[PDB]
Design a protein around this ligand. Sequence first.
Ligand SMILES: [K+]
Ligand SMILES: [K+]
Length: 149
Amino acid sequence: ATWTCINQQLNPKTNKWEDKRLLYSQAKAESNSHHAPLSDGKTGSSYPHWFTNGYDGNGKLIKGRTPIKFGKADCDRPPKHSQNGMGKDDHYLLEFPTFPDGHDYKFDSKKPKEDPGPARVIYTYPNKVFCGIVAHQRGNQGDLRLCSH
RNA sequence: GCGCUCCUCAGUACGAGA
RNA sequence: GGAACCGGAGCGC
Ligand SMILES: [K+]
Ligand SMILES: [K+]
């Protein structure tokens, strides 16, 4: 499967924010999540960690936010995330950087951590079910949108 | 002693718009 | 997302 993300990137010349299209292999993205450790932000980079998707630890909407629909049960299931995402019955979503070249993000990188880019592979804790690839609408921050495929 | 820089503190406390 | 205080060095005065 091929996923397409649209990311706005600043042009240093025109100084205007321009659209950038980015293609990612799903296999590589899943591979990225398999090789990433299964902890919630306890690496030097802080990745991977909890992707709330608009919810709080008790699986209740946050009000004002609209969760992304991944189209899969385990994924769209409201989260159960404890103080450090290690609850024995915890279940939630993780986000980890993913790129077009598909290389594994150096999760232990720090000061400075490797650039995480705009895209993230989203998957479940603790069975790493693939949910999708999202990407910040503009820059490497702000609103995260579901990409196409 | 005053001003600026870097390391560290620390991906911590704090947090959920990441 | 993400500080500061305390802690150590450099440059200038
Ligand atoms: K400092
Ligand atoms: K200091």
